[PDB]
Amino acid sequence: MVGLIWAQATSGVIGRGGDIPWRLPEDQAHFREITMGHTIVMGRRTWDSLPAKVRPLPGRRNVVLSRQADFMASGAEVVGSLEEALTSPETWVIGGGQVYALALPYATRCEVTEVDIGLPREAGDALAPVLDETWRGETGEWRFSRSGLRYRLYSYHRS
Ligand SMILES: NC(=O)C1=CN([C@@H]2O[C@H](COP(=O)(O)OP(=O)(O)OC[C@H]3O[C@@H](n4cnc5c(N)ncnc54)[C@H](OP(=O)(O)O)[C@@H]3O)[C@@H](O)[C@H]2O)C=CC1
Ligand SMILES: CCc1nc(N)nc(N)c1-c1ccc(Cl)cc1
Ligand SMILES: [Co+2]
């Protein structure tokens, strides 16, 4: 099982300037719950976005995708292809934009947090991948985050 998990603005933006233009503690808890214990695969830029004092993310096999043969990610595995990372029973691809696009053919689940923030797409933004007709989607109710933004959770599945 390979799943993708991301939070997006309604526009599809997931990242800007190498970081994220919101922070929802409820989304962080959801992300932690879904990925805990499992493999997490991230692009090198997403690894770079984590403060050194917080990485590797606890309780998970942290894997970083990079073209750099000597790139060192202390506390993680660095691999040069996504296929190398898929050896565990449950694998979550945790971003960013480039790696979601690369992982989508292997994926059967997408766990999406939609953040009700009006954020037009700008050049250089990382975006959520486009899900074609093979994906079945299940939507939760809109909720209020303590950060003031509404959010809702989608669960997309396909065989
Ligand atoms: N809202 C959310 O849920 C999430 C948001 N984000 C945001 O997304 C943004 C980062 O996403 P993005 O900029 O797309 O960068 P990625 O995190 O997708 O990492 C890109 C890097 O992955 C490596 N890579 C890409 N393609 C390949 C390949 N074919 N083979 C080997 N290695 C490859 C390269 O590493 P190298 O250059 O070392 O070769 C490349 O620079 C940030 O803003 C981050 O905050 C991140 C995760 C989730
Ligand atoms: C809590 C933010 C978040 N929410 C969701 N729904 N998915 C994610 N993949 C992330 C995320 C973004 C960047 C990093 Cl470094 C780790 C996780
Ligand atoms: Co689990």
Curated annotation (Swiss-Prot):
Biological process, per Gene Ontology: dihydrofolate metabolic process; folic acid metabolic process; one-carbon metabolic process; tetrahydrofolate biosynthetic process
Domain DHFR: residue ranges: 1-158
Highest taxon in the source lineage: Bacteria
Matching SUPFAM superfamilies: Dihydrofolate reductase-like
Catalytic activity from the UniProt record: (6S)-5,6,7,8-tetrahydrofolate + NADP(+) = 7,8-dihydrofolate + NADPH + H(+)
Residues bound to substrate: I5, W6, A7, D27, R32, R60, Y100, T113
PROSITE patterns assigned to the protein according to its UniProt record, in alphabetical order: DHFR_1, DHFR_2
Gene Ontology MF annotations: dihydrofolate reductase activity; NADP binding; NADP+ binding
Entry EC no(s): 1.5.1.3
UniProt-annotated binding residues for NADP(+): 6-7, 14-19, 43-46, 65-68, 80, 94-99
Alphabetical keyword list: NADP, One-carbon metabolism, Oxidoreductase
InterPro entries from the UniProt entry: DHFR (IPR012259), DHFR-like_dom_sf (IPR024072), DHFR_CS (IPR017925), DHFR_dom (IPR001796)
Gene Ontology cellular-component terms listed: cytosol
Pathway given in the UniProt record: Cofactor biosynthesis; tetrahydrofolate biosynthesis; 5,6,7,8-tetrahydrofolate from 7,8-dihydrofolate: step 1/1
Family statement: Belongs to the dihydrofolate reductase family.
Function: Key enzyme in folate metabolism. Catalyzes an essential reaction for de novo glycine and purine synthesis, and for DNA precursor synthesis.
Name of protein: Dihydrofolate reductase
Species assigned in the record: Mycobacterium tuberculosis (strain ATCC 25618 / H37Rv)
The organism's taxonomic lineage, starting at the top: Bacteria, Bacillati, Actinomycetota, Actinomycetes, Mycobacteriales
